[PDB]
Write a protein that binds this DNA or RNA. Structure first.
Ligand SMILES: [Mg+2]
Ligand SMILES: [Mg+2]
Lengths: 239, 239
DNA sequence: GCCTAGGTCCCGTCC
DNA sequence: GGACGGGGCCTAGGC
């Protein structure tokens, strides 16, 4: 019975059903290559005409449909969904999501391959260069901002919003940082500017916003300078 | 070049190479089930220990590595990545991208299955329920906003930023619309307020922002009201 | 559950 | 090319 992989090319309906249902029940990865048509209804609504795609169903209920291009799936369902195979004029893979109600229907016109991959993964990703690690860097070593900077809070909620880092300078002013792990764009400045306005209410005009990022878009620089805010160039560190 | 699909389970290196080669050469989809390690250096840095994953290489250079959970590849590479297979003491898939420089390395420790799928797809997705369709609604039916509302511009760049819908109202003010296809968050109110400020600079005190969306989060309504902006409930249309 | 914000975001678009 | 903002965003962290 059980090897990591079970493949059948150009399978019978009996074989299809056999494997598909076995995948769902054994909680393993179903992969399929097929000519299909897709029907999605949910937050938005979509239609995809006949063509060959890859289809993946994870044991956690995530459902992917990949065309020959891009990175993103053309259609999907996120983890937690429930899938059932339905026999009709053609077999149909059907994933239902509750909360929000969403339906994905993959009509299988021709199945070129069905497979069951019983995959064992105990390892999880280890990633460095996050903005969280920027914050770790700053709290360990505040001078990367400027002399006498005193970081105090992280992900601190002010009244409306949550600021990346809140602290004080050598003059005793409230200081806001918004951090970005890549070049900072207009929404970055809008974030900072938003937090500073709100802080100016309690603490007055003392308050300095600083954008901390490796670089800055032209439009970000403009809006920064128009609003009298500051920029510290900082690269996110790699372990 | 051959049948739609080729599959080899527990391939030899010669078989593995043969297939991978054919895939890249034929603009097919490469699919691998394998025990592997993944190393990524680029915009960020990551490491992933030995484990079973589904690996996909699309002919447009897209590179997906999927574990048994979530919707998201654990590691990946967007279109325009040269992939190739180097033989170290294990075969390694190597995907490189420039601008920015990024290296993805998948060390195939045990390949359980390799497959070449010459997928044929001429169909593009049709989706409805989007921000753009809200916009269209508003232009062909301005009264969904308010009576005597005249829409003028769509995706119109003002000095700093790009407004969703720009227009005028019956009493002669300039109106800014920010649209969201789903419940609106702080991010959207910051966008709106930002735009309104900038347009106040030319046209002074007569400017209205209106956030148009099916609903607001708590902070969104909080901040909306505080800065004296307006809301119209609207649901994206599904055609 | 809702809210808030990041992401190796991807991706389209228009300058 | 850089830049700006949507997405069925997803996903993680508070609460
Ligand atoms: Mg932040
Ligand atoms: Mg907008």
């Amino acid at each position: 019975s059980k090897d990591k992989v079970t493949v059948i090319t150009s399978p019978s309906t009996e074989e299809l059903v056999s494997l598909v249902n076995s995948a769902l029940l054994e909680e393993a990865m179903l992969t399929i290559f097929a000519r299909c048509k897709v029907h999605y209804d949910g937050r938005a609504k979509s239609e995809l005409g006949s063509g060959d795609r890859v289809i993946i169903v994870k044991p956690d209920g995530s459902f992917l449909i990949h065309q020959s291009k891009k990175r993103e799936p053309v259609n999907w369902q996120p983890p937690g969904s429930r899938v059932r195979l339905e026999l009709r004029e053609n077999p149909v893979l059907v994933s239902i999501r509750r909360k929000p109600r969403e339906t994905l229907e993959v009509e299988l016109e021709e199945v070129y391959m069905v497979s069951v991959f019983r995959a064992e993964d105990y390892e999880e990703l280890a990633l460095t260069g996050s903005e969280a690690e920027m914050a770790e860097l700053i709290f360990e070593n505040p001078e990367v901002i400027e002399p006498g900077f005193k970081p105090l809070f992280r992900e601190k909620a002010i009244g409306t919003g949550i600021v990346a880092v809140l602290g004080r300078d050598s003059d005793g002013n409230i200081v806001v940082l918004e951090l970005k792990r890549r070049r900072a764009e207009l929404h970055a400045v809008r974030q900072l500017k938003s937090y500073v306005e709100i802080l100016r209410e309690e603490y007055g005009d003392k308050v300095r916003g600083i954008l901390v990022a490796p670089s800055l878009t032209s439009g970000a620089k403009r809006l920064l300078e128009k609003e009298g805010l500051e920029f510290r160039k900082l690269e996110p560190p790699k372990r």
